[PDB]
């Protein structure tokens, strides 16, 4: 419900789980899907640190 302001934006750290990126074309349509270093269309097959 409550997000962060401009100066005091929050940092969230996530690991040891699975991120189902397949459920992405199902929300309020992202106006921005600008993805650099990465081709975002159905390429969720990589393991990040």
């Amino acid at each position: 419900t409550r997000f962060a302001s401009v100066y005091a934006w929050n940092r969230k750290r996530i690991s040891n789980c699975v991120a189902d990126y397949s459920v992405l074309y199902n929300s309020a349509s992202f106006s921005t899907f600008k993805c650099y270093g990465v081709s975002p269309t159905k390429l969720n097959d990589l393991c990040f640190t």
């Binding site: 990465v38 081709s39 269309t41 390429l43 097959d45 990589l46």
Partner: protein, 48 residues
């Protein structure tokens, strides 16, 4: 790179790589040819 990127940019990446590697190959070939010529000269002298 193949597993990561899309065709439109993978194209330019692989072109860059191909150009560099081809340049190296050509340089190596030229050096080998020159060395072979010198060896031929030495062989003729030895035969004489």
């Amino acid at each position: 790179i193949l597993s990561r990127l899309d065709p439109p940019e993978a194209e330019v990446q692989i072109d860059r790589l191909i150009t560099g590697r081809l340049q190296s190959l050509q340089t190596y070939v030229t050096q080998q040819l020159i060395r072979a010529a010198e060896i031929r000269a030495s062989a003729n002298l030895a035969a004489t």
